[PDB]
Design a protein around this nucleic acid. Structure first.
Lengths: 120, 209, 56, 113, 122
RNA sequence: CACAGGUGGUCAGGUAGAGAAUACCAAGGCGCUUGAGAGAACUCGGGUGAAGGAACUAGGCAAAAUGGUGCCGUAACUUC
RNA sequence: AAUUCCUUGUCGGGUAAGUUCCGACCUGCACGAAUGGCGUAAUGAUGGCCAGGCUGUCUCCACCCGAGACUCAGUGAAAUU
RNA sequence: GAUGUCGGCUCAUCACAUCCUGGGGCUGAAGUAGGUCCCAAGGGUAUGGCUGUUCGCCAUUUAAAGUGGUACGCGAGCUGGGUUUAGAACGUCGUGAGACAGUUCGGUCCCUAUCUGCCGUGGGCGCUGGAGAACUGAGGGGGGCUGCUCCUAGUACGAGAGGACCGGAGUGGACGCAUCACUGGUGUUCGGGUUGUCAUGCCAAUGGCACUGCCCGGUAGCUAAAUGCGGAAGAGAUAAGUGCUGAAAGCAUCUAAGCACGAAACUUGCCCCGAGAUGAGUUCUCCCUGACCCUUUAAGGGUCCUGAAGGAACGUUGAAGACGACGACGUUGAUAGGCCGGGUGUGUAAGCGCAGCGAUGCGUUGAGCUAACCGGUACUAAUGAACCGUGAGGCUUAACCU
């Protein structure tokens, strides 16, 4: 009954959870701005920030391991080149969450999530 | 004589000279300070109120801050009252050490057990699970019958069914203490104590033989 | 399981005492535009902690 | 932290490092109530659970046509000496499959290093 | 562990080869038998020329446990195959003359020296 | 009923497979008109479980287990 | 006995222990020879029994994966009275 | 006008006409062990074959495997095994349809809890100024089981065999509570092996699907089969019983007076809840020390200013949790997330070169990865705020202070 346990269920099984985490993380790293629910972004952090930390070091093995996630060559290409130097001098906290109210369709807690600076 | 109040950080086995492993519980105890002393004249009974640990000044509000300042004691995590032994006397503000448990050799530990939330009948009262086959339908862990026919016409109080377990005081008696450390402020007691790691524990001398 | 007697309107309204909604009182006051918004939330135009957060 | 403080000083600093699947000899202290003597145990280690003071390893022996499995504590005073003659070559942390297949058909290899 | 209706082997040369543990002694509502215990067994198949026959009921003493034996220092003694020693009903005396297989040291604790003495191992 | 039901005929790809079975894909068509949170008791569909293996039960009910090819080999009875 | 109330008829096998089953006797209330008697290989989503493997059926339940059950947003019944 | 019947599973409760444990009397009571009777219900009171069986026979344990009530307890808790609607057959009766407290096979067990009842958790109000804490305890609830061995003691008894009372110490089964230190299980969020297929242009290497595609292990947590503890000792009043003195009744008498023992029975003593205990308890600490007007002139009303202590709300969250509620933190911070180090688990990552035609191995390498675990780190998220909560708290009496 959840004693020192982590990992939300999101009303999905492991395969769907992993797939939609992967799609969400790819969309975020592509766009640098995503609006979604609070738990979804909170669980996104634990996938994207380690991905950024892995991308901080550029190597063929590191690039292959990164490609094992997000299943996208363009996503990895954007990594190790753009977000690497930007977050090279940053130790964690690459993403931040800004609440923006609730949806009008299902009344779900909405929040924007973005990077630190976004170069904008 | 009185006991101490401490916090559990974990439990680990202890190796003896003959190789026998003694699993004991590690409880850290801070130097308690007496905050109040009660007497027959004012409260009608003798007891001493003590505190342990430290609390942040911002979280501490004015009432308990003034209560602590009256006794000259700093902020503490919580307050507890210990009954004396008809002749033992304590003064306000003196610190309580740990070496006084060098001769009791038997302690009683009370604390808040791990909360299991809303538990079922099988898990709560150790009931017997019904058969999962032979035509059984929608009744596996259900309590089943909870009373007789209309002649009583009611359900008696204290009947056993599902409820909330844990998050309550649990007392374990006749626990052997192995080693006590004064310079490090640790107590080693044989056996298992109720509660989780980091929970506040109250240790008292054994009342039984 | 079904009712044996009809409950009165007194019972209905007496059950609904705890169903009353709770209303916010002190949502927030913006330090730049001075518009109401939810606590720890951005405003209508994406203002939080004085600085723009959404850039439209 | 505090648990570790009791952990370190109870460690034994003369614990050998043995790969899983090696031939390991364990000398244990057996007491008859009056005299202490050394008992030898010949076998191959099949599982190692090295976690703090609770480090343990499981060794299997085929004696009198019957397989016996015994565990030990690397920091307990019951043991006296641990020696390894032949080092096995298995790419698995656990060697639990040795129970099913017979010993004559389950000859281990040597790492050659 | 050892409980009722359990297929058991033999550690002695009495004449039996497989015995059926069907009752465990020691007290009311006895659930399991450890390494040293008194149990009631029935012969399921034995050598025709052995000291015992088929269908006989007699008392047995456990020698090896599949689950293991809990040592005072957190050590377990596992085994591959569970056996027992045939004993007389009226008197707790072994029937077989030899013991084949490992024997635990716990049998000495509860005053069972006959099996320990004529055992060519621990 | 914008219903987990039924409704005749034709077209019949690739991989592996004896196969129109089975598993993934081609073209093609969809995610099944309520969503979002947490992962209590309990219910349903499942996975695994140290020791015993039917001792539970009216009853091996349900579960669990075997499952193919080639070769060797294969009992009582019999209308052969 | 698909037939027997006396019956768990008597004996043996199977089981440590068998009102079930099988094999011998007939004391057939109330079998009986085309409203057919006996046997019969193969066959049967047929009744009963036993054996081997197998397992949470159980001893003794524990954990985990999803759908409901819990909360919020919207729509919004029922039997009974 | 209707599933409602017997048995089985789960769940139990009450009575003692007591199965054991406990206290005794008599005995045709040497002792152990037996028979009878009295008090005592605190606790416990079996596993399998046959039959559906309740009941029974058998086999093996224990102290026993108690007797009954509760719609022969309990089917809006489960089972449909007996009987049994619709089918069919056997034996009997009837010419027959059909029947048979004669036998065999098979043969739908519904309901989303309105109220009382019970288990847990909350909101309002009250406890008379408000608020934060800590406790006494009126009451209520949980448990109260014992086998074996040894010393006493082979002592008393006993011709020997046999074998004590009382007391003390250990070790067992069941029950309950607690914990994950070990042993394991689970651990579809960790790693690895492998089959088919598809995709990343291709080789390599990865990803999806096929029950987590099939397996091997395994972090934390949970859990038991794992390990720690408990069933008290003692005190007070007693049932049966044993008594002292003692008249009525010159004796005698446990009783008429008085006094002393006496059981797992009752209350304490063990643990938990507990001041809604409206009889609303006790203690400590903190805060509030303005003005004006009107009316029917009093626990009156109204206006301006003031908004204290604290509470409330939001965010991070939890070994707390259905929701509530509880606990920790909110820049004066380690509350959560990320990162570093460490630990654990899996197992020698990819790439390079070499050997081998090839599969494959080798040095790089116990390498790479590592979720929930440990110690640090403001890198990110916990905004300045605002809302509720007030302005000294009635009457009468009693003791002091002027």
């Amino acid at each position: 009954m959840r004693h020192r346990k982590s990992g939300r269920q999101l009303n999905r099984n492991s395969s769907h959870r992993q797939a939609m985490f992967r799609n969400m993380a790819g969309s975020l790293v592509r766009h640098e701005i995503i609006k979604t629910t609070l738990p979804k972004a909170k669980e996104l952090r634990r996938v994207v920030e380690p991905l950024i930390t892995l991308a901080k070091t550029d190597s063929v093995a590191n690039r292959r391991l990164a490609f094992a996630r997000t299943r996208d060559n363009e996503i990895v290409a954007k990594l190790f080149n753009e977000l690497g130097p930007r977050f090279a001098s940053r130790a964690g906290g690459y993403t931040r969450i800004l609440k923006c109210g609730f949806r009008a369709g299902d009344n779900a807690p909405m929040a924007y999530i973005e990077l630190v600076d976004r170069s904008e | 004589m009185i006991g101490l109040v401490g916090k559990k950080v974990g439990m680990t086995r202890i190796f003896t000279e003959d190789g026998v492993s003694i699993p004991v519980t590690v409880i850290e105890v801070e130097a308690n300070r007496v905050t109040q002393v009660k007497d027959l004249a004012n409260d009608g009974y003798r007891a001493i109120q003590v505190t342990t640990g430290a609390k942040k000044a911002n979280r501490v509000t004015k009432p308990e801050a003034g209560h602590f300042a009256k006794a000259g004691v700093e902020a503490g995590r919580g307050l507890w009252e210990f009954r004396l032994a008809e002749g033992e006397e304590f003064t306000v503000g003196q610190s309580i050490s740990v070496e006084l448990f060098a001769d009791v050799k038997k302690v009683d530990v009370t604390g808040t057990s791990k909360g299991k939330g809303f538990a079922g009948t099988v898990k709560r009262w150790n009931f017997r699970t019904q058969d999962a086959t032979h035509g059984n339908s929608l009744s596996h862990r259900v309590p089943g019958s909870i009373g007789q026919n209309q002649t009583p016409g009611k359900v008696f109080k204290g009947k056993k069914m599902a409820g909330q377990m844990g998050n309550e005081r649990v007392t374990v008696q006749s626990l052997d203490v192995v080693r006590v450390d004064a310079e490090r402020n640790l107590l080693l007691v044989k056996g298992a104590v109720p509660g989780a790691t980091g929970s506040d524990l109250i240790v008292k001398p054994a009342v039984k033989a | 399981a079904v009712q044996q007697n009809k409950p009165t309107r007194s019972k209905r309204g007496m059950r609904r005492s705890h169903d009353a909604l709770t209303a916010v009182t002190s949502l927030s006051v913006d330090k730049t535009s001075g518009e109401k918004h939810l606590r720890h939330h951005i405003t209508a135009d994406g203002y939080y902690r004085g600085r723009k957060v959404i850039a439209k | 932290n505090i648990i570790k403080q009791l952990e370190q000083e109870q460690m034994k600093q003369d614990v050998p490092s043995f790969r899983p699947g090696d031939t390991v000899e364990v000398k244990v202290w057996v007491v008859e109530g009056s005299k202490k003597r050394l008992q030898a145990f010949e076998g191959v280690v099949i599982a190692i659970r090295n976690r703090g003071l609770h480090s343990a390893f499981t060794v299997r022996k085929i004696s009198n046509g019957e397989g016996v499995e015994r565990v030990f504590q690397t920091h307990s005073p019951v043991v006296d000496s641990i020696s390894v003659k032949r080092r096995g070559a298995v790419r698995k942390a656990k060697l639990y499959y040795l129970r099913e297949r017979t010993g004559k058909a389950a000859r281990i290899k040597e790492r050659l290093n | 562990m050892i409980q009722e209706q359990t297929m058991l082997n033999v550690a002695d040369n009495s004449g039996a080869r497989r015995v059926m543990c069907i009752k465990v002694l020691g007290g009311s509502h006895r659930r399991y038998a450890g390494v040293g215990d008194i149990i009631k067994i029935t012969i399921k198949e034995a050598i025709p020329r052995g000291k015992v026959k088929k269908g006989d009921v007699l008392k047995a003493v456990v020698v090896r446990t599949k689950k293991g034996v809990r040592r005072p220092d957190g050590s377990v003694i596992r085994f591959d195959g569970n056996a027992c020693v045939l004993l007389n009903n009226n008197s707790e005396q072994p029937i077989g003359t030899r013991i084949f297989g490992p024997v635990t040291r716990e049998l000495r604790s509860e005053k069972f020296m006959k099996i320990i003495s004529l055992a060519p191992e621990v």
